[PDB]
UniProtKB/Swiss-Prot annotation, chain A:
Shown residues in whole-protein numbering: 8 to 129 of 146
Protein name listed in UniProt: Small ribosomal subunit protein uS9
Origin species: Homo sapiens
UniProt keyword Ribosomal protein, yes or no: yes
Coiled-coil annotated spans: none
GO CC terms: cytoplasm; cytosol; cytosolic ribosome; cytosolic small ribosomal subunit; extracellular exosome; focal adhesion; membrane; nucleolus
Lineage of origin: Eukaryota, Metazoa, Chordata, Craniata, Vertebrata
Swiss-Prot record, chain B:
Tissue: Weakly expressed. Expressed at intermediate level in testis and ovary.
The species this protein was found in: Homo sapiens
Family: Belongs to the RRP12 family.
Subcellular location: Nucleus, Nucleolus; Nucleus membrane
Protein name, UniProt field: RRP12-like protein
RNA sequence: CCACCCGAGAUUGAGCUAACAGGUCUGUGAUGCCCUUAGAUGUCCGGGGCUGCACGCGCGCUACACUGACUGGCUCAGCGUGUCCUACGCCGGCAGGCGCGGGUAACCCGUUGAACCCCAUUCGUGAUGGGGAUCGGGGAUUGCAAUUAUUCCCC
């Protein structure tokens, strides 16, 4: 009845746990508006602002984030939230909603589903 | 017959390797106290030294000698004066917990474990032994864990420790590894309802994604399914519930640390389903075979093998 | 590779310290010369110097500020280490002292509680509160010894 995904950027890894909810999006016990780089706030509302709160009506998602910096953590957060929604709609919702959401997200930006293979090199 | 406390009191590598020392001969001939093995007159006579004296390297030495001598089964005498041993040892426990020494506490916990293995107040002594697993000292904690394992595997006391371990899971982040070691070493000797409760709580800590606690608690899965538990310890329907509940994580596709032991634990679990009820095991097998066929697409050869 | 049937024979006899450049290194000569109270650096002791500074040729650090300086709050790493790495409490303006524990180490330091960065305050285009050299005083550790400032702290 729940799904568990991960999303990485450089070193930062954000793990997202998604379940039947009431429309709350939570990270590290803090609301998504309550993350300290408010300059980069619209990047982390991109799934919500792109997709609306109507399809986030009955979804409870929690994200716990390890490592990295600040920007890499934010990208890991948005990637993990998006993969959590995609896997939840894979396992518990139909497939047409899956391909519709994936088409919207890919036509917006590529990094929000697939991770950047580049990392810090020796 | 004394001065063995002064023999173990000296700590030099030239004298540890001697045959007369505490390495070999104390384990053999010192147990025969007065020609007959064994007498706790040494134990009852060292009350005057183990009370109101906190001198190091003498309390630890007599604790070491008591731990080494106590194993040679004075069982009816132990059943008789278990009350005296428990009271003396709990006041020693409280004094050492207020003081903060390691060796004396470690060996009195070891000989307490020997005492409890050989044998209402016994439940109090069991919680006294059990309370020092979350103790931060690696030498106290390992001794307490090994002692609890020796007591349980050598049971009416499984209920208290199962409820306890669930409880300090629920309050608690570095003691999580220690109580997961407790589960890894104590899961087979639990009753079915407590197995269900520990499994549910263990999935509740599977909700977090710290790699160490997840890996060691799924190693506790490996430990519970590896021992081939009986019907009263693990039922078929509970095993079916925890095998259909464990399908919800599948780390990713290519993590290679939890994936191999993951296929190992569903291997052991499906073996247990087949051993308990073969038709139900064959019924739950196809999802496992489908997921296995799916995870042969991993880029790592170790996952494939 | 082993064993066996058949077969006379499933292996019975002859010939082949020497060579190396493959590596590499301190023994033989009654060896040639030059030295030997002109010790192929004679041992030890005390104190200095190696830093000395007009100047050239070059690696670097800090800067010349407003994309900034100060003050407060916020929140994120990894490669590595340790019987000297330090956890906790007390005395401390601060360098630091005192009593105590763990760690010969995926355990304790350490969820390594990092800095840039972010959000608020003051400054307001000038040798400025930017920049910190050079000096004057005190204090504390390291070490037999800090005078030619070892280092760190405070005006």
């Amino acid at each position: 009845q729940s799904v568990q995904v991960f999303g990485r950027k450089k070193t930062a890894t954000a793990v997202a746990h998604c379940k039947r909810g009431n429309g709350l999006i939570k990270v590290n016990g803090r609301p998504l508006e309550m993350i300290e780089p408010r300059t980069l706030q619209y990047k982390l509302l991109e799934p919500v602002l792109l997709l609306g709160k109507e399809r986030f009506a009955g979804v409870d998602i929690r994200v716990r984030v390890k490592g990295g910096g600040h920007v890499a953590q934010i990208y890991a957060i948005r990637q993990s939230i998006s993969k959590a929604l995609v896997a939840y709609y894979q396992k518990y919702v139909d497939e047409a909603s899956k391909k519709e959401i994936k088409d919207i997200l890919i036509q917006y930006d590529r990094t929000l589903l697939v991770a950047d293979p580049r990392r810090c090199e020796s | 017959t004394f001065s063995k406390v002064q023999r173990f009191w000296e700590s030099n590598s030239a004298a540890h390797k001697e045959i007369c020392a505490v390495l070999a001969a104390v384990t053999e001939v010192i147990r025969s106290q007065g020609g007959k093995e064994t007498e706790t007159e040494y134990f009852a006579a060292l009350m005057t030294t183990m009370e109101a004296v906190e001198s190091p390297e003498s309390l630890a030495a007599v604790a070491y000698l008591l731990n080494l001598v106590l194993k040679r089964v004075p069982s009816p005498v132990l059943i008789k004066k278990f009350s005296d041993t428990s009271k003396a040892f709990m006041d020693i426990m409280s004094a050492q917990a207020s003081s903060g020494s390691t060796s004396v506490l470690r060996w009195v916990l070891s000989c307490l474990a020997t005492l409890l293995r050989k044998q209402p107040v016994t439940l109090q002594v069991y919680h006294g032994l059990l309370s020092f697993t979350v103790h931060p000292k690696p030498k106290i904690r390992k001794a307490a864990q090994h002692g609890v394992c020796s007591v349980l595997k050598g049971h009416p006391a499984a209920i208290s420790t199962a409820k306890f371990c669930i409880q300090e899971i629920e309050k608690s982040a570095t003691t999580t590894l220690h109580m997961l070691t407790l589960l890894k070493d104590l899961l087979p000797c639990f009753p079915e309802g407590l197995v269900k409760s520990c499994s549910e709580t263990l999935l509740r800590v599977m909700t977090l994604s710290h790699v160490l606690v997840t890996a060691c608690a799924m190693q506790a899965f490996h430990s519970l399914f590896h021992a081939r538990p009986g019907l009263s310890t693990l039922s078929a329907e509970l095993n079916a519930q925890i095998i259909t509940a464990l399908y919800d994580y599948v780390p990713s596709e290519n993590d290679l640390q939890p994936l191999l032991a993951w296929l190992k634990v569903m291997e052991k679990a499906h073996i247990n389903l087949v051993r308990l009820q073969w038709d139900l095991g064959l019924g739950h097998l196809p999802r496992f075979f489908g997921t296995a066929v799916t995870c042969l697409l991993s880029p790592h050869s170790q996952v494939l093998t």
